[PDB]
Every structure is written in C-alpha cells, then in structure tokens.
A paper describes a structure:
Taking inspiration from Ubiquitin- and ISG15-processing USP-substrate complexes, we semisynthetically obtained SUMO activity-based probes that contain a reactive warhead at the protein’s C-terminus. SUMO2 and SUMO3 feature identical Ubl folds and differ only in their unstructured N-terminal extensions. We prepared a SUMO3–2Br probe with a 2-bromoethyl warhead as well as a ΔN-SUMO2/3-PA probe equipped with a propargylamine warhead. Both probes reacted covalently with USPL1 as evident from a shift in molecular weight and led to pronounced protein stabilization as assessed by protein melting temperature analysis, indicative of the specific recognition of SUMO by USPL1. In contrast to a recently reported SUMO-dehydroalanine probe which reacted with USPL1 but not a SENP deSUMOylase, the ΔN-SUMO2/3-PA probe reacted with both USPL1 and SENP1, but not the DUB USP2. We solved crystal structures of USPL1 in covalent complex with ΔN-SUMO2/3-PA to 2.4 Å resolution, as well as of USPL1 in complex with SUMO3–2Br to 2.17 Å resolution in a different crystal form. Alignment of three independently obtained relative arrangements of the USPL1 and SUMO folds revealed near-identical positioning of SUMO in these highly conserved areas including the SUMO C-terminus, the Pro66 loop, as well as the Gly27 loop in the fingers. Recognition of the SUMO fold through the Gly27 loop is in striking contrast to Ubiquitin and ISG15 recognition by other USP enzymes which use a hydrophobic residue (Phe4 in Ub) as well as a large, complementarily shaped surface for many water-mediated interactions. In contrast, SENP1 cleaved all substrates completely, including the G27S mutant, which is not contacted by the SENP fold. These data demonstrate that the pronounced SUMO paralogue specificity of USPL1 toward SUMO2/3 over SUMO1 is based on USPL1’s ability to specifically recognize the Gly27 loop, as a serine at this position as in SUMO1 would disrupt the water-mediated interactions with USPL1.
Ub/Ubl protein conjugation can be reversed by specialized isopeptidases termed deubiquitinases (DUBs) or Ubl proteases, which antagonize Ub/Ubl-mediated post-translational modifications. Moreover, we focused on recently structurally characterized USPL1, which is the only deSUMOylase with a USP fold but for which its mechanism for SUMO paralogue specificity had remained unclear. USPL1 featured an approximately 25-fold higher activity for SUMO2 over SUMO1, which suggests a much more pronounced paralogue specificity as previously assumed from fluorogenic reagents. We structurally and biochemically explain this substrate selection, as USPL1 uses the USP fingers subdomain to contact the Gly27/Gly26 loop of SUMO2/3 to discriminate against SUMO1.
Author numbering:
A (entry chain B): 16 to 91
B (entry chain A): 225 to 259, 262 to 282, 297 to 500
Write the structure that this text describes.
Amino acid sequence: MINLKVAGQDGSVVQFKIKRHTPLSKLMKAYCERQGLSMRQIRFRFDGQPINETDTPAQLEMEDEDTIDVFQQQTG
Amino acid sequence: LCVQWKNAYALCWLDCILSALVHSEELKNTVTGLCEESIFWRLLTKYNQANTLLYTTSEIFAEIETCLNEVRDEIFISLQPQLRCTLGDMESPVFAFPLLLKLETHIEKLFLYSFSWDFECSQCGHQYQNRHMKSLVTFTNVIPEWHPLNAAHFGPCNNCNSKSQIRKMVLEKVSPIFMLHFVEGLPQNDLQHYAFHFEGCLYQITSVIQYRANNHFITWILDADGSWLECDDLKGPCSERHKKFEVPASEIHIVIWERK
Ligand SMILES: [Cl-]
Ligand SMILES: [Cl-]
Ligand SMILES: [Cl-]
Ligand SMILES: [Cl-]
Ligand SMILES: [Cl-]
Ligand SMILES: [Zn+2]
C-alpha cells in the first residue's frame, strides 16, 4: 500500500492508506465521507497538478507520506 | 479604456489572469528592467501593441485578435502538461495562476510572500505556528472581521475534531504583488477597507477576479482616475469603464494587492 495525507483549505488533514495501483476513486469517496463533502463539489490537487478519479498513485508517481490538496470545485 | 482577449474554447480562466497581468505596474516595471526571451516580455509587448491599435475598421481588429491570441495560445500550451487539460475544458485560475508564475522565476519572485498559519484550539490545547511561502493562498469561511492584518478564518481542530477554532495567517514578508483567493468571496465589497500598511509600504487592491454564477471568470482593473475596467471576455475584445466597483462581495474570487 502507501500512506497519503489529504489537506483541505480549512486546515483539516486526513491520512489514507491505499495500494499503489488502485485508482484514487475509492480514496476520494472515502475522504468525502469523513468530512461530509460531495464528490461533485471538491477537487484534488497533488504537487500542484489536478487529479482525475481514474488516476492511480503509481501513474502519478506518488511517494509515501505525500500530501494531497483538497479544493472546493470552483471552475469556469 | 483598454483592450482585452475574446472568449474562445472556455479560456476565461486564463484570460482573467492575462488581463490581471498586463495592468500591474510592478510587473511592467520588472519586465522592462530585465534584459528579451521572456514569456512575460512577449505577453506585455504583444498586449501594448494591441492596445495601441485600439487607441487609433475591421482590419485593425483582426490584427489585435492575432496579437492577443498568439501569446495566449503560447501560454496555454505551456500550462497544459501540468494542468492536464484539453483545449475547450473548463478550469480554475486558482490552479492555473501559480503554475503560470513558475514559468519565469524572476516574475514569480514578485508574488512570493512569507507568512505563518497561527492556530490555538480553545477546547483542547492543540496548537501550532507554521511558516510558509506562497504566491496564492486560499481562504474559506473567513471571520466577518477579516482583514489582511487580521487574516483569520474558521476551521476544525485536527486533535479533537472540534469545529470553529480559528486559524490565522500572520504576514511576515509581503512581496511587491500580493494575491489571495476566497472560496466564498469577501465579507463586503468596499475594497478600500482591505487596504493595509505593512512595514511602511501601503498595499491597495488594484485588481480583482470575479467568479460569476459558478461558471464564468471576469477581471476588474483599478485605473488612475478611480474608475474601473471590466474585462469580461464574453463582452468581446473591448473593455468597459465603470464609475465604481461592482462585483458582488460573494463573487470576489481572487484579490490582487499591489503598490509594494
Ligand atoms: Cl476544503
Ligand atoms: Cl505537476
Ligand atoms: Cl489535447
Ligand atoms: Cl488563533
Ligand atoms: Cl458592502
Ligand atoms: Zn482541539
């Protein structure tokens, strides 16, 4: 697996363990369930880059103890 | 009055940044000190070449469109790999802007400010004071009395999951250009009350990116005469002069302080 930290703009930080080749959709949905957020209302960013739900940690070359940034989705 | 980019391929999330860039006095001063081969030099030179054309029928407008679209396309193609979008996608300037600044280190330095997140829980003792350096920080659920000199917001405590503790940004060294993003806008829209002094230098809001209807970005520029210029890329290539500030407080998405 691997350990990831999910940090929101409100200062919250949630730890996740995930396998290196499982897509981040399960991770995203579980973080939403803990914080009471909607998947349609938030975005994930890693190392400055947006992440799709189909992305995996290995495809984005995430290392252990890395941090994922959460933003409320505000596009145009 | 001034010229601006026209809407196409849903690029307002980029147009709003570009319009913000060309009307910054500090940036213009920096680009003309540097000495050529800059992406920002090409941006501001193509912009002024287009604005001089507007100062002077239809043939003039295609040349303006060509000058603005050429440099816009170059910037978009440079942003594309990290930002991972396909042309025609919707996106956010909160994501695009710092990636844009990293294209030129001498320009990014104009925006990099240092601060510290100061936190102290009142239910339990969890406390921290963390120093950071950013070009664009996001605020959400700010306290009503929010001010750059009292830059605080409501947040949960990571130790006890208590809500409504306060995390506060304490500015430590402010760059000549200072930008902030607000998820729900500012508490009110009288921008003069968000002016502040820091170590002897006055900082005023010189431009604002408005987030309208949760689907469209528009740039507002403060001019010398006190009037404002609205750069809604949907309203075509020319801009609009307004007697006073107009964006609803809840649509103030990105705020740019300048004047070093
Ligand atoms: Cl958040
Ligand atoms: Cl990246
Ligand atoms: Cl493509
Ligand atoms: Cl505090
Ligand atoms: Cl007001
Ligand atoms: Zn606490």
